[PDB]
Symmetry: D2
Subunit: 493 residues, 4 copies
Amino acid sequence: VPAPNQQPEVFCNQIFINNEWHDAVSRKTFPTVNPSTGEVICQVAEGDKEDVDKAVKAARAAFQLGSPWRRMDASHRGRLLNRLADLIERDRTYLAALETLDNGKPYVISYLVDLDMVLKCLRYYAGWADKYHGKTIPIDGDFFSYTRHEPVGVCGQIIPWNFPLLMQAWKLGPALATGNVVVMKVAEQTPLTALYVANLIKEAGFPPGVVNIVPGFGPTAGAAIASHEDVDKVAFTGSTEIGRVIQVAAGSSNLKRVTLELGGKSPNIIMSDADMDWAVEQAHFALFFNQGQCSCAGSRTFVQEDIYDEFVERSVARAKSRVVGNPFDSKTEQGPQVDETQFKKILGYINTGKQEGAKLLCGGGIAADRGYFIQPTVFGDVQDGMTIAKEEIFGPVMQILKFKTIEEVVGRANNSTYGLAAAVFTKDLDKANYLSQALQAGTVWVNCYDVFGAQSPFGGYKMSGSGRELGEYGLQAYTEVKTVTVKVPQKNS
Amino acid sequence: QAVPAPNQQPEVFCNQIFINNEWHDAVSRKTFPTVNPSTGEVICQVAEGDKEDVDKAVKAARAAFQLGSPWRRMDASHRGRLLNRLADLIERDRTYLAALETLDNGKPYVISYLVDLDMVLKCLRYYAGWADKYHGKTIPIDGDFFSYTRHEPVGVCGQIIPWNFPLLMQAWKLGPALATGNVVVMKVAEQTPLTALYVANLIKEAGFPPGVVNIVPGFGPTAGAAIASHEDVDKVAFTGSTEIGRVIQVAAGSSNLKRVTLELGGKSPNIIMSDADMDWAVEQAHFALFFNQGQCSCAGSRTFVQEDIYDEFVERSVARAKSRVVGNPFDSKTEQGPQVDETQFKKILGYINTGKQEGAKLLCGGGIAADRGYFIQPTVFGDVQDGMTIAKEEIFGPVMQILKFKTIEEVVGRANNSTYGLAAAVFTKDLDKANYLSQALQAGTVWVNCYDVFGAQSPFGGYKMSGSGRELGEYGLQAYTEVKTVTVKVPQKNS
Amino acid sequence: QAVPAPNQQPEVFCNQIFINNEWHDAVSRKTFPTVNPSTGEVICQVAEGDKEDVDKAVKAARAAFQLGSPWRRMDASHRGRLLNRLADLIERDRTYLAALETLDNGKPYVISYLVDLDMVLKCLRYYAGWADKYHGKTIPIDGDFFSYTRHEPVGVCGQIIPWNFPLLMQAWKLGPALATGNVVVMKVAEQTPLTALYVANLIKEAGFPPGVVNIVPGFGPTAGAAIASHEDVDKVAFTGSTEIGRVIQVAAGSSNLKRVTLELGGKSPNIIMSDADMDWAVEQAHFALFFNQGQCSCAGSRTFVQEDIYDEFVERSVARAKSRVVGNPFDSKTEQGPQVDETQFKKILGYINTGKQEGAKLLCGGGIAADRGYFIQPTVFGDVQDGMTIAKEEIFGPVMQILKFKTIEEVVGRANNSTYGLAAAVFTKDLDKANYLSQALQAGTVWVNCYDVFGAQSPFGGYKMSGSGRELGEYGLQAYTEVKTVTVKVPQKNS
Amino acid sequence: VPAPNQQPEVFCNQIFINNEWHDAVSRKTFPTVNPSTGEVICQVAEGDKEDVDKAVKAARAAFQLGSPWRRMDASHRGRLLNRLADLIERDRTYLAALETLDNGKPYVISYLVDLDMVLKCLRYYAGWADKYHGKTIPIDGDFFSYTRHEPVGVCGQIIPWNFPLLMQAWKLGPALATGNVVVMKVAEQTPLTALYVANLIKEAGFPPGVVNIVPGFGPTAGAAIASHEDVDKVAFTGSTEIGRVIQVAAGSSNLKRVTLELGGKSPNIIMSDADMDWAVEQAHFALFFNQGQCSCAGSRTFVQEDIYDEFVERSVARAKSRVVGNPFDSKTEQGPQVDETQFKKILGYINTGKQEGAKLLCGGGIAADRGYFIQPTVFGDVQDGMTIAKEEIFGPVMQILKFKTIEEVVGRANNSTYGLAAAVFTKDLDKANYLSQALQAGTVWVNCYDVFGAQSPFGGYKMSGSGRELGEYGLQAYTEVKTVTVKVPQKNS
Ligand SMILES: NC(=O)c1ccc[n+]([C@@H]2O[C@H](COP(=O)([O-])OP(=O)(O)OC[C@H]3O[C@@H](n4cnc5c(N)ncnc54)[C@H](O)[C@@H]3O)[C@@H](O)[C@H]2O)c1
Ligand code: NA
Ligand code: NA
Ligand code: NA
Ligand code: NA
């Protein structure tokens, strides 16, 4: 890993519309903080409804029949996505450092995980741009019938702060591969890296108005997108509570199409025949990755009785060894939480765990006197009705639950309004097949956790959301299907 | 001609709530009348299902969907066999069901038999074939993993349908849902409950496990709303008005974030270029608008005609509308039966009044066609302009709007200047005009030299406020599929 | 148990050449006997089709395929309906056809009824569902063009099939060919012509247009060769021996470059790891080899067993083979009927003799089981080694080879050290062993903890000299599809 | 277009195996000629059976389970294809000049058409490498059944001289995208550009043995590949007569899988309502492109009676204007034919046309005293039984036939043992739909000709071959389908 610049310069802090940079109409700004220190990095333009309106107008113009973007060869959309990826790779060291600065995650992880996954996502989707065929369809009668896979049009895309660049890429790849135009609302905690990437979108040669980015708050700019009468589709990643708000805003306005990637309380099931230390280390990763700030987090670790004591002992030792510190130090495993709001809320959940009778095995408090650092925390003897067992914590707080039978753990795993992900650790073919079929989750990992690939789709069951991102499936939400049915003189096979 | 003679007074056998392969009164014991629109007389009372009935239906559907249940364990091919058996039973009872359809809805019996029932049979048979063919994927993910997707059912599917094509809308919903192994709670329209309840009896006869299909007749803001807001319904599919579409999507968001697909209203443009075949275009434009008493969101309700042929097109269209026979729908000479109910009757008369007052030229019809039932004269307005109410709002009756245009660029902009986008058509002999217009129109279906050409193979649904999602075709399965990725660590991935 | 009682002397109704929905003698007026293998007696004479008969059949098929013909114009969904009607007719006549199958081929009636006929019905019904679902594509080519593909039929398809599963091999061929709108000239095996000719009668009854399916019984180097070399056959599909596969592919190349798919021989490995469920593995290994009198290219004819369990596996396998009932195939207690003919009888006895002489341990059987018909004792060889003839060559009879191995790396190399590659299986409780072996084996089907699990949904066919192409599944349509790209200049391409 | 080097240096003239360069075992060589001058460019290693054997052994080793190529991520195969394309683009000016030197086609066309299409083909297929999914299949019973899309293994690929680099790319793109290994036999007339590209395959980082190239003759090296007992699959592009030989060699050996892209006598149908000058110019291109050396050539130009005289007059004027000359001169439209054999054979066909009663309207003779240049030749009043109407000429010899009705022209167009391509020129929707359905051809162009895209498949009906190249379809011939059917405890939907 190239040595980081621990104070990367910030070049882009405004609203991006028609490949130009704007202040907000109000000229208001908001601070973004470095969570390692609690100090302001810079001010950022505070986009609201009137800024969103400009962005939507720009997007709609760029989507007009006969525009450069509408007429461009699909293969050329792919070329432009590949060019974007090459520019990100050129600027990989900078972007990883800026990602760490704004978000808090370790720089080694920003570089080797986030930036790698961004490159792979964009390059994957570049390949789709000229391959998502419609159909020729052997309808009854003397007709030629076929489908066109058109773009849906103006796509509102609202993303969170936990993986700023990667969440941007998961949205832009499929939308652009299929010829949509975008109005993106980046998270107020972490706007900077996506704004830099907008500069690279301009540099790559995307036509103006194809990607517009409005930094600002959720109930102002975000809600303006979800409520807008000329936005055709919204994709939202965030909390389940806000997903409700989005779907109500869509239905209340123009019945735009909605996909949602929401919260989780994902069960990680360790059968007694698992490989012990692999299970312990994967369970540790499953929960603590990215400071616990993952909707995918394995935050109910179900451990079979016969291995429970050993598994717990090992898990506690591993949590106690996990290095919390400055995210630019290569020894650091865990940076701060993103902001003070999250910091306080996680400490609040920890206090609920103690009060409700879970066993605090390690951690439980603040880890530093500056920035938002929380000790890696492990609770044992967790039970299904506890707050920490039910609600998404989004911090470094692990729940270990004991179970006896496979039928029992299916029922407890599934007894959630969430269904984003799950995992099973076992050597047994039959247990793996049974559990992967039975679990009500959009991704089931077997003998692994948090294995993402641009090829394989991701998304929720139940209140974890609707639709899928990544893979071929990621294109469906960005496609408007048009049937053309043509009278012909004489149909033949 | 193969249309068998109808019973004009088909007996009603089924008029209750259908839950777990059982027939029940409403919890309240209330009933509501359904009326024969040809006479205004009550056919029979039907159980008035409400929230408590919907709750029982959802519990029965949930029980049928439990892991390990007969419906969950059944071979996909066997789901196909069940769909084909249901189709056979409907075919057995085709003459009866077509007559019952006409009795309760008002459409001509010949059309109930040759269109509605034929399309029901073809839709169920088409989807039977999908049951064991909607594959998931094996995916060559990076690293030492085997990754694949399972195409699972979503679960408990609430399905709310309108009165315009009672049996066909039932089949568009049941076919993909059942093919993919979902379970159903269906709320049929209060104006047309009877044929769908008969089909429930045939579902039971076919051997579908109890609870797989449940039907709750009742009103919209009671039973329909209870489905849309229910905390244990995983998915809702709604076909109806754009206005109630907004209610459904808000209910979904405000309750449990159930998945939502919508098939809503239209104001579809039918574009006649000056090189069209005139005779063919005139008759197809007539069909496009007047089919099913005008009660189709598909309807070609903005007939755009190029100025060089406009006068002749209008004269020929008026002639044809004057010749269109309004009558008892059991008479095979009848082309147009009554509108479905008194509310619709009055609304359409209201739109006709608006049309006259806002400056459209009334060229024929415009009034009541009979002193009993809900019959309206075929009505043609000429010199219609884009800003008129009758050019913007869906009338849902036998009221035709003819507009004049000059150029292709003009007519693309005018046709697309709507919040609706369900369908469109272009009539032209030219290859290049056909290709350009079919690309340019913002509509979910574009017909070329035809109109109202539906096939179970080809998807249908809206752009813009005409809805979200597609019915029919392979696409119709997407809304009923929950995709699960399974990603397995392996010892050594090889190609 | 739902197996209906058989007629042990089913009447033969159809014994001629089937062309254009007509029954004909051979041009030569020659006939050939088909024999009941249970008794060695002639059932009846069958018309002996040759080149001149094949020429008439091909002309009838070509006429049925002409542009504008009823079969070319027919709706794809209607091709589906015809396939479903044929299935219904076969189901109507299931008891008869299962008995006739057993009479002519020798397999147990219970298996003819519950396996062969069930699978025929499921195959035709599966493919009926594909008829209107094998979409071409709309393709976003560079430039101002609209490009798409049509999935057309190839045309006149020559289909040559063996005697081991007469009706099922007929259905594997007809299902995809007819679903995609091809026409067929089929050459059935001379040992088992009768059931396929009956099914021709049902094809006619179902309403397929004349000439769409034509059947020529006769010999291989006469009628079969005439099909493979014919200048007006567009495609041949052959299932049979690897040796005749080479003849077919050479004939195709030497005549008109017709398209060729082949389903050939096997020497499939069945690998029992030491953590297998022993009782289950023993019974499945027994089935794997002995199913259908050993007459299956699918057969698990190299049973590899890990050394820690080898002795017990062998003792239990011998016990089971000693218990396997050989008898009249109409007796429901019979597990093994006769071999199909005297040539096969002698060949298998020859392989048994080779096995003994080349050092394999004869553990049971090895001889003739009855003094009439072609019955062979279930035969088990232990301590089989890779270089033995009985470990390399396909025996096609009730002769089981058990080999010992130690390691996974070893058994992958040994299993793959064959020019065959049709199927394979692994028995293990471990996830990682199952995944690794399923990736590593060079076989078109790998079964895990099972054997001989066929479904119309899942493709089947060879690696290496076991053949080219796949039957069953969506994949089975590929060989019957001619892809046409249509690329149209348009005024202005938009996304 | 960058100015060409009219004498580019030749770096690579040997057999390429395991990313190394070898003489033939025999140490024999063969000359490759510059067809513009008839002079030898250089000697090339003359590969035969023993060289093929080495190549097949190298390919088989590279395909072993657990090899680098077998274990590489599919996405990484795509990266390597993209890297290959970038290296070709780096060396585009050189490769276009070498292509012209060896083959004869104009340098402007080598640069703007061949090299562009090579880049686009490789970049298209790079995108497929991680997207050609197998299936999960809802079989009856308590089983999990799925397909793996494996590679077929060792793929013999035999290509012609008419589009040397492009034919290489049409073969390598799909084979490598799907993880096969290759033994390629390049045409003896034009070996040089493909050998240079092998050097770029090494430079790109493909593992040794993944691509092996054996220059040499057809009945020696080509036949050795088609007959080889350890080649799993052969793809052959060439003449129909040799396609027969290939299929016989496959059936006579190991029953390898065979696809064939063979000859043509493609009908180009001009209806009376066509746009005249567009039809004339497209018909001219259709026949004369690439010195007539295209199996796709529109070599039966069917012209409706009412436009025949004008169409012919215009076609003759255009042929008389077509500039024959040095292919490095930017004014040159037509270079020489590839070799003396072709030169003589084309002159022989011209003499048959004269003798059988076709009307020679222009050309008909040699166009220069050095190199293999033939005048653009147009025959009128051609009839269906004439040699020039039936047989593939593969030179600048145009056939114009007159017809009256659409039913007549369908029957005459289809009355051929060839079926590679066809076209219709018309304004009429119904005529276009009828003819495109009725014509027995693998590609039907409407109001265009020779419109190729990597997205859209190409290949023959009848004796024009089997299988398709380009598009998703191009992957099918390179995929070995494996069904895995696994007993499970309890199947659920
Ligand atoms: N359908 C298509 O896509 C397509 C494309 C380009 C060219 N073509 C055909 O290209 C041909 C190329 O020129 P050609 O006339 O020299 O073709 P050809 O068939 O003689 O040669 C084609 C290739 O096959 C090799 N070959 C020749 N004899 C062989 C044999 N006995 N065994 C194995 N390989 C052998 C040649 O060396 C060369 O590499 C044209 O005749 C045309 O018919 C077809
Ligand atoms: Na920040
Ligand atoms: Na009614
Ligand atoms: Na027999
Ligand atoms: Na040369």
